[PDB]
Amino acid sequence: GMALQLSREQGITARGSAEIVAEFFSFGINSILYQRGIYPSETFTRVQKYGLTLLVTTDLELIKYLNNVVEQLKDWLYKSSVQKLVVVISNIESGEVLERWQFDIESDKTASAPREKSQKAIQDEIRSVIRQITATVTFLPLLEVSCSFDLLIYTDKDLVVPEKWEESGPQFITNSEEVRLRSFTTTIHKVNSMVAYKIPVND
Ligand SMILES: [Cl-]
Ligand SMILES: [Cl-]
Ligand SMILES: [Cl-]
Ligand SMILES: [Mg+2]
């Protein structure tokens, strides 16, 4: 007679996309911090995500810091207010900017009914991007200096700056080359990934 179905959220909503992208950044930032030795290897634990074994921090302060960033990102991503996220890697002793992991975000401001793209398909794309973050490091110059990180979120100039957040300098890098990574999309957001790395000197 009449076909009924118990509602089961399939596809992607603007909220779902924001969730997905913010989560990707949490895992991506964790991978970069581990791969560039920002935090010691023993401060990371193995976890399953996107069909991969990924390393995520156990450091209490870093967990809270990154969680705070991810929560804020979801809000701004839903609003289509994030233009890019950059993980700046600098020589801890000199402050020299050595790498800039740049994630340019494109948004569908019209995002309404849920979009027809499976979570699986999206995870498949993210999986390749995450693998490429680790793969890319094997092609960069050997890093043999202790470094620090800065996480910069570039937003629409008109956004309200929440408490605890601050307008920061751009942390310009110079004498760099780039490695373009695979992009991924939820159909609502598209995340482009690339790393700008400084060419060292023959000293
Ligand atoms: Cl781009
Ligand atoms: Cl690899
Ligand atoms: Cl720059
Ligand atoms: Mg040297």
Author numbering: 0 to 110, 114 to 205
Question: Which of the paper's sentences describe this entry?
Answer:
A cellular surveillance system called the spindle checkpoint ensures that accurate chromosome segregation occurs by inhibiting the activity of the anaphase-promoting complex or cyclosome (APC/C) until all sister chromatids have achieved proper attachment to the mitotic spindle. The spindle checkpoint protein Mad2 binds to Cdc20, an activator of APC/C, and inhibits the complex. The conformational switch in Mad2 is critical for Cdc20 binding and APC/C inhibition, and is regulated by the protein Mad1.
C79 and C106 of Mad2 are located in close proximity and tend to form an intramolecular disulfide bond, causing conformational heterogeneity. To facilitate crystallization, we created a Mad2L13A,C79S,C106S triple mutant, which retained its abilities to bind to Cdc20 and inhibit APC/C in vitro (see below). However, we obtained crystals of Mad2L13A that diffracted X-rays to a minimum Bragg spacing of 1.95 Å and determined its structure using molecular replacement. The two monomers mainly interact through the C-terminal halves of their αC helices. The dimerization interface of Mad2L13A is symmetric and consists of residues from the C-terminal half of αC, R184 from β8′, and Q34 at the C-terminal end of αA. These residues form hydrophobic interactions and extensive networks of water-mediated hydrogen bonds. Bridged by two tightly bound water molecules, R133 from one monomer forms a network of hydrogen bonds with both the backbone and side-chain carbonyl groups of Q34 and the backbone carbonyl of T136 from the neighboring monomer. In unliganded C-Mad2, F141 points outward and engages in numerous interactions at the dimerization interface. Thus, R184 of β8′ indirectly contributes to Mad2 dimerization by forming an intramolecular hydrogen bond with the side chain of Q134, explaining the inability of O-Mad2 to form symmetric dimers. Mad2L13A, which predominantly exists as the symmetric C–C Mad2 dimer, is functional in cells and is active in APC/CCdc20 inhibition in vitro.
